[PDB]
């Protein structure tokens, strides 16, 4: 299987965004 580099970069960026979103949503649910 072959993929493009920009796909990998967007995947890594979305992974970082998913981690930070998990953190912030856990902090939000904690306050409630």
């Amino acid at each position: 299987l072959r993929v493009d580099p920009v796909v990998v970069l967007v995947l890594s960026l979305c992974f970082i965004f998913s981690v930070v979103g998990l953190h912030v949503i856990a902090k939000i649910t904690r306050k409630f």
Binding site: P5, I16, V19, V20, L22
Partner: protein, 437 residues
């Protein structure tokens, strides 16, 4: 024997055309930033109702890739003999498979045995989040390594990561903004920050400068200047080379020169010595932590704060500072002797397995057609074997002496990191000058 696994493991396609230099530099500069962002992000699940590579999505980090590379280099040295493309493809597939397996196992053992949230206290549906985060980080790292190795990058991923980590540690030790309140007013860990603060907010300027230079507790200015001087000296020394004349025999007339630098097999002996001392220190520490009630184990290594002392590992331990050296003269003597001998012999041994032996270079020049431009029928092998081994055995001792002197003078960070960063950036500059601009 790994034929069925080839279509499973994904990869990135090879560059269709010859990538230019600007786009390659952009790829490198974006990959390094992505790696740093990955290494400076907190993990999830660490909060359980009661950060430097501890929860930074890099617990496994680069260790599986480099471990697989080392073990496969050792296997290849022990013997993939034929140099066809199929052997290279099988080697790369085995590399990637072993890497993913080792990364998954490391993540699982790290999340299960401890050092993080406990399974009983946390639960049975939370640790899997940690496992998935870690394996995703490992897969992204092993895929960006191949993205930089396939040709889109200028060097290797692991070397670039080590260089940027060393330079980051140096710059952080330089301009640290964190304070430490050990009494008598807080102080800045950063060198220049403290040199400014103590100079400005204290009435006794002279004593302030005197204690700011020779602090010896936090990174100070004098050792920073020593690091800068060692950097300049090694940069000036890297450029040595013995240009030996050579004229071709097939296409008559064309001249040239064959360079043989003083740092032959660059930064290889220091890396081998560092690995050896790290392994022996780990073995001695693990043995003393359990079987301390013994005689030969006590003679091998005794540890007390964290720092080895009164043992073989004590002699193996590098000197801390100038005073820590001059207090024990014979210790410094034996350490200098061991370091020089080990570096020299490591260079002289690695020069054979690396394939740069005088016989191999002579055969390569004979096959390529290059012939010595001697006075009257000079044999290339004679002068080559007269020059090369001396150069290697001297460069080994020289780089060992430089590393030990940098460690004794108290340079910022260990000398191995300085030498590695210097030689990596020098190789980058060399290839950039080889290519256009």
């Amino acid at each position: 024997l790994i034929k069925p696994f080839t279509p499973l493991l994904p990869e990135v396609a090879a560059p269709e055309t010859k990538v230019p230099f600007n786009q390659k530099l952009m790829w490198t500069g974006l990959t390094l930033l992505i790696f740093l962002v990955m290494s400076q992000m907190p993990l999830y699940g660490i909060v359980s109702s009661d950060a430097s590579n501890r929860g930074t999505l890099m617990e496994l980090g680069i260790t599986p890739i480099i471990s697989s590379g080392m073990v496969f280099q050792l296997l290849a040295g022990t013997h993939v003999n034929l140099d066809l493309k199929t052997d290279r493809e099988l080697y790369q597939t085995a590399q990637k498979l072993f890497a993913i397996i080792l990364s998954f196992g490391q993540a699982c053992v790290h999340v299960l045995t401890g050092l993080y949230g406990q399974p009983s206290d946390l639960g049975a549906g939370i640790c899997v989040l940690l496992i998935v985060q870690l394996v995703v980080a490992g897969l992204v790292v092993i895929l960006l390594d191949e993205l930089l190795q396939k040709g889109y990058g200028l060097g290797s991923g692991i070397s670039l990561f080590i260089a940027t980590n060393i330079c980051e540690s140096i710059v952080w030790k330089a301009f640290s903004p964190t304070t430490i309140n050990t009494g008598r007013g807080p102080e800045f860990e950063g060198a220049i920050i403290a040199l400014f603060h103590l100079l400005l907010t204290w009435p006794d300027k002279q004593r302030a400068l005197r204690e700011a230079f020779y602090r010896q507790s936090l990174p100070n200015i004098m050792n920073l200047l020593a690091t800068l001087l060692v950097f300049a000296a090694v940069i000036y020394l890297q450029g040595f080379r013995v240009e030996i004349p050579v004229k071709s025999a097939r296409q008559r007339g064309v001249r040239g020169s064959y360079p043989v630098r003083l740092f032959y097999t660059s930064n290889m002996p220091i890396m081998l010595q560092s690995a050896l001392c790290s392994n022996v220190f780990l073995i001695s520490q693990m043995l003393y932590s359990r079987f301390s009630d013994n005689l030969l184990v006590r003679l091998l290594g005794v540890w007390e704060p964290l720092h080895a002392a009164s043992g073989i590992a004590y002699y193996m331990s590098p000197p801390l500072n100038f005073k820590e050296a001059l207090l024990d003269p014979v210790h410094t003597v034996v350490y200098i002797t061991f370091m020089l001998v080990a570096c020299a012999l490591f260079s002289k041994t690695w020069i054979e397995v690396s394939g740069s032996s005088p016989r191999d270079v002579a055969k390569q020049l004979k096959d390529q057609g290059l012939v010595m431009a001697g006075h009257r029928e000079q044999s290339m092998y004679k002068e080559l074997k007269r020059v090369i081994p001396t150069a290697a055995a001297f460069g080994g001792a020289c780089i060992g002496a430089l590393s030990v002197a940098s460690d004794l003078l108290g340079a910022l960070g260990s000398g191995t990191g300085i030498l590695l960063a210097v030689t990596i950036i020098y190789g980058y500059f060399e290839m950039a000058a080889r290519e256009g601009d």
